[PDB]
């Protein structure tokens, strides 16, 4: 057999976490799974910017740190747009027909990453400067 069979290969304790993340989860539409991905990554990305910044002991540091993190999400919207412009040219079908294999929903995924990414950057701005 071509794949190696270690004892922890095909373990249900981690094959259940993979099947339930919003990249492999079956029930989601690409608008929803872009929102769930975008809400998780935008929430922690404002972490390193407010505590490790060029300005940290200022008025001043929680806003400009979170202003930087939404700067990453608006950069990464382009990267998800450019990866969809390149790898799905003509919406190139393949053998699986998922969001990742053929395009088929991809313009909604980038907007979903845009909404949830800019949300949780601003959502975590509330819990740090206030609350």
């Amino acid at each position: 057999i071509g794949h190696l069979s270690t004892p922890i290969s095909n373990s249900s304790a981690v094959n259940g976490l993979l099947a339930n993340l919003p990249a492999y989860r079956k029930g989601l539409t690409p608008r929803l799974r872009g929102l769930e991905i975008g809400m998780a990554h935008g929430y922690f990305l404002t972490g390193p910017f407010v505590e490790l910044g060029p300005l940290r002991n200022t008025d001043g540091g929680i806003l400009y740190g979170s202003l930087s993190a939404v700067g990453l999400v608006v950069i990464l919207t382009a990267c998800l747009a450019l990866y969809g412009k390149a790898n799905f040219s003509g919406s190139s079908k393949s053998k699986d027909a998922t969001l990742w294999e053929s395009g088929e929903g991809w313009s909604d995924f980038v907007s979903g990453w845009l909404i949830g990414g800019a949300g949780s950057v601003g959502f975590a701005y509330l819990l740090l400067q206030y609350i």
Partner: peptide
């Protein structure tokens, strides 16, 4: 004041635009 607008435009924004049209022009196909 015009230095403060122009140098993050062609230092950051304008390379990110020309990187986008090039990366689409590279990976497109006839």
């Amino acid at each position: 004041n015009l230095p403060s607008i122009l140098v993050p435009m062609v230092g950051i924004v304008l390379p990110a635009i020309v990187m986008a049209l090039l990366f689409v022009y590279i990976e497109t196909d006839e």
